[PDB]
Amino acid sequence: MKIEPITGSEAEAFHRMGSRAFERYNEFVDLLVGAGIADGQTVVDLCCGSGELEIILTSRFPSLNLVGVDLSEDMVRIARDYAAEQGKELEFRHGDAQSPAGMEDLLGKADLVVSRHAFHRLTRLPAGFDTMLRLVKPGGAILNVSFLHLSDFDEPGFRTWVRFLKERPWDAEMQVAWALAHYYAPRLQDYRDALAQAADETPVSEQRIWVDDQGYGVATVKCFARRAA
Amino acid sequence: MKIEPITGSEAEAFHRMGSRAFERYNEFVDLLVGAGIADGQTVVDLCCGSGELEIILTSRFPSLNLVGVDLSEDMVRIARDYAAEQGKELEFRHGDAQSPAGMEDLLGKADLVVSRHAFHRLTRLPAGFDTMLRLVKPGGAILNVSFLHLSDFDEPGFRTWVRFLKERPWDAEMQVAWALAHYYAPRLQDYRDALAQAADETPVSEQRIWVDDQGYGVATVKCFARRAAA
Ligand SMILES: Nc1ncnc2c1ncn2[C@@H]1O[C@H](CSCC[C@H](N)C(=O)O)[C@@H](O)[C@H]1O
Ligand SMILES: Nc1ncnc2c1ncn2[C@@H]1O[C@H](CSCC[C@H](N)C(=O)O)[C@@H](O)[C@H]1O
C-alpha cells in the first residue's frame, strides 16, 4: 500500500536533492503570486517537508508569517535546522493535513493555505481539502499542486515522465519512491471529486482544477479555490 | 437540511395552485421576451415542475420546441398528463439540472435555457449554471429567476415578503416550504459567484445578475448571460 510520510535518510536525501534544485519550486511560487500572495499575510503550508518553500518564500517575501506543517517529525526537525542554517525564524509544526487537530489556533486565519507535491500521498484526499478550507479565512485562497495518476498521462506526457525519471540525479530507491507516488496518485477526476466534497462543507466563490507543466518537468495537477466571503 | 425535489401530493398541490395562477408567470415570460425568445427556437426549461410554463409558452409561441426537465418523476408525470389534458405536444424528461446526464443530445442545441423558482434549491448552484451554458448554443441566452436569501432583503423588501406570505391563498404546510426555500436560498453574491464560475468554464459575451420585483410579488434574483460566439 501507499506510504504517507517521508522519514529518516529518505527525508535527508529528499532535502539534499531539493535544496540544490531551487529552480523546480518556481512553478509553485508563481501560482502563489497568481493566487494573490503578498507581504504580511499568514500562509500555512501543509506537508511542508524539509522547508525549501519556506526559505524561498521568506527570502522573496520577508514580511510573510509562515507556518509549515508535516506529519514526519524528522522533516519538521530538518526544516528547523535548515531554517537556522539559513538564519531565518520560521515556525514548523508536527501535524496531519487530513485534520485541523493541532492547528485549531489557525482555523479561519490563513490568507493562503497551500501544499506542494504531497496530497497524492493522502489516504483521504477530501479530508486534505477540508482542512485547507477550514484553515483559510473567508476570502482567502487554497492551492494544491500534486501528482497525477499514471493513467491520466497521454503519450507525450508519459514520454516526458519516463525521460524526467531517467534524467534526475537520484538513486534506485528515490527513483522508485517518486514513480510509486504516481502509481498511487489520484486521478484528475479524484481531485475534482475531493475538492467538490470539501466545498459542499465549506463554500467557495471560485474553484479550478487543471493539469499542465509550467516548469517542474512533468504534468502535475493544480487545484485552486477561494473560500466564499 | 435543504431539500431539492417537490414530490407526491405536495407536487399535486403545487400543480393545483399554479394551474389557476398563470399571471404569476408573466414576469418570467416577459424576461424570456427580453432575452430574445422567438417562434421555432429550441428552449430547455430546467426544473420545470408541473409544466405550467410549458403550457403558457406553447400557447403564446405555438412552434417552439420545448423541453421541460425535472428531478421529480411525479412532476414529470403531472406535466405530461397536464399537457395531454390541454391537448398539447410537449417533451418532459427526468433529469438533474446539476449535470448534463440524460441531456447529452441537447448539448449545445438550445437557443434558450431557462429555470424558474428552482435554482435556490440546488445543492451545487455553480453546476446548475454550468449545465445551462453547456446546453445553450454559442450566441444563445440563459435565464434563471429564483429566490433571494432572507439576509439580502432590506426593510421594505422584507415587509413585502411577509405581506405576500400572509395574503397567498395557501395552507400552513405550503407557507412553511416557501419560507424554508428562502431560509436556504443563496445570497445575491452567491449567485454572482456561481455564474462567474460557470462562465470561467464556458465563456459568455454578456452577463448580469440583479434583484427586483416586476410582477411575482416578492423580490427575486435574475441571472442572465449569453454564451460567447464559436
Ligand atoms: N497526511 C500528511 N500530513 C502532513 N504531511 C504529510 C502527510 N502525508 C505525507 N506528508 C508529507 O508530505 C511530504 C511529501 S514531499 C513534499 C515536501 C514539500 N511540500 C516540497 O514540495 O518540497 C513529506 O514531507 C511527507 O512527510
Ligand atoms: N436538482 C434539480 N434538478 C432538476 N429539478 C429540480 C432540482 N431540484 C429541484 N428541482 C425541481 O424544482 C422545482 C421547484 S418548483 C418550480 C417549478 C416550475 N419551474 C415553476 O416555475 O412553476 C420542483 O419541480 C423540483 O422537483
Numbering used by the authors:
A (entry chain B): 1 to 229
B (entry chain A): 1 to 230
Please give the exact wording used by the authors of the publication that reports this structure:
The overall CouO structure exhibits a core with a Rossmann-like α/β-fold typical of class I SAM-dependent methyltransferases and a cap-domain accommodating two α-helices. Based on this structure and in combination with molecular docking studies and site-directed mutagenesis we identified key functional residues for enzymatic activity and propose an alternative catalytic mechanism for this group of enzymes.
After extensive rebuilding and refinement, two CouO molecules in the asymmetric unit could be completely modeled into the residual electron density. In addition, one SAH cofactor molecule was present in each chain. In CouO, this motif is also present and involves Asp70 forming bidentate interactions with both hydroxyl groups of the ribose. Structure examination of CouO located a cavity in the vicinity of the SAH binding site. Hydrophobic residues are arranged along the central part of the cavity, directly above the sulfur atom of SAH, whereas His and Arg residues are situated on the periphery. The lowest energy docking mode places the coumarin moiety in the vicinity of the cofactor, whereas His120 and Arg121 are situated about 3 Å from the hydroxyl-oxygen at C-7 of the substrate.
